[PDB]
Amino acid sequence: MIDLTAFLTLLRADGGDAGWEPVTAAVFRSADGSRYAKCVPADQVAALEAERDRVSWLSTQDIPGPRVLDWRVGAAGAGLLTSTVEGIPADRASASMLRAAWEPIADAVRRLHELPPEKCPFTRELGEMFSMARDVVAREAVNPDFLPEEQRHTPPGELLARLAPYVGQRLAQEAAQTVVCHGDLCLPNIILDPDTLDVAGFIDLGRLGRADPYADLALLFATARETWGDDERWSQSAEEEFAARYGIALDRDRERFYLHLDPLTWG
Ligand SMILES: CN[C@@H]1[C@H](O[C@H]2[C@H](O[C@H]3[C@@H](O)[C@@H](O)[C@@H](NC(=N)N)[C@@H](O)[C@@H]3NC(=N)N)O[C@@H](C)[C@]2(O)C=O)O[C@@H](CO)[C@H](O)[C@H]1O
Numbered sequence: 001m002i003d004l005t006a007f008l009t010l011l012r013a014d015g016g017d018a019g020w021e022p023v024t025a026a027v028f029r030s031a032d033g034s035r036y037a038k039c040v041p042a043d044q045v046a047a048l049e050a051e052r053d054r055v056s057w058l059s060t061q062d063i064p065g066p067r068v069l070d071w072r073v074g075a076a077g078a079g080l081l082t083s084t085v086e087g088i089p090a091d092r093a094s095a096s097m098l099r100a101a102w103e104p105i106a107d108a109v110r111r112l113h114e115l116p117p118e119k120c121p122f123t124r125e126l127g128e129m130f131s132m133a134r135d136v137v138a139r140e141a142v143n144p145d146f147l148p149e150e151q152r153h154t155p156p157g158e159l160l161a162r163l164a165p166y167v168g169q170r171l172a173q174e175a176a177q178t179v180v181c182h183g184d185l186c187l188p189n190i191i192l193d194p195d196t197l198d199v200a201g202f203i204d205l206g207r208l209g210r211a212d213p214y215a216d217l218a219l220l221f222a223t224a225r226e227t228w229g230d231d232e233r234w235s236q237s238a239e240e241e242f243a244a245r246y247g248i249a250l251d252r253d254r255e256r257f258y259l260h261l262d263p264l265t266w267g
Contacts, residue, residue, distance in 0.1 A: 002026045006076030007039035039079040051206035052080050064201035087200035091187035098227050100197035106245040108199040113179040122209035124183045133264035141267035174212040183207025185216035187223040218258035
């Protein structure tokens with residue numbers, strides 16, 4: 001299922017006894033922890049190339065993220081090698097730790113969302129993402145582990161149908177308020193400095209591009225709620241506070257649309 005023999009061949013090609021090992025189209029890490037690679041089969045190479053481009057371009061935008069170390073291709077696919085963003089993935093933070101980071105994350109994400117969207121070479125706009133969802137749902141390829149708990153036992157065709165009639169309205173809201181989004185702004189993709197709890201950088205950038213800011217905020221808030229836990233009241237305060245620091249007035253219906261669409265878009 002995972003082409004370790006092809007991928008390794010790519011990674012080992014420059015020698016130097018690096019001790020590449022799989023850590024998940026797989027992700028590998030060097031023995032010394034200083035480099036990662038993402039590798040994909042032949043069929044997915046354009047998608048990985050577009051990720052490479054996103055990472056390379058973001059390095060010219062003064063937004064903290066990895067550097068592209070190498071791009072390697074062969075008959076059995078491609079690999080994208082990047083520098084480690086050192087620190088602790090935000091999903092691994094305790095509540096207290098995530099509270100230390102919370103205003104720094106709002107600042108960092110605000111900076112990303114302040115890039116001029118019409119200057120971004122990349123897009124993850126809704127017409128693209130909705131089309132992807134139609135495809136995944138047609139292929140019966142939705143992973144229910146990604147859905148909201150209360151949706152996991154509903155057929156994804158039904159779940160797509162709940163969203164389908166809102167696409168026009170949501171496109172009009174996206175036109176009105178487009179930003180450059182991270183594109184998968186779940187807590188594991190925000191690395192924290194383990195001493196100051198400022199943001200060290202962003203990782204997993206293959207969906208970077210124009211979209212409604214809620215394509216990012218929906219994921220960030222939902223995944224932070226895994227940390228904040230049973231505390232419904234702190235979770236709402238936390239989101240209001242985030243919204244005030246970041247500079248947006250919460251639109252819950254729009255946030256929910258993005259939360260409910262995202263899972264349908266993977267596979
Ligand atoms: C599909 N993309 C990845 C995945 O995203 C998921 C992720 O899905 C989560 C929830 O929906 C929730 O019900 C959740 N709830 C449970 N009751 N167990 C999670 O288990 C779940 N995460 C997961 N399977 N890895 O949280 C959601 C906000 C998501 O972004 C939906 O697409 O999960 C992430 C981390 O969990 C990754 O960072 C992603 O890249």
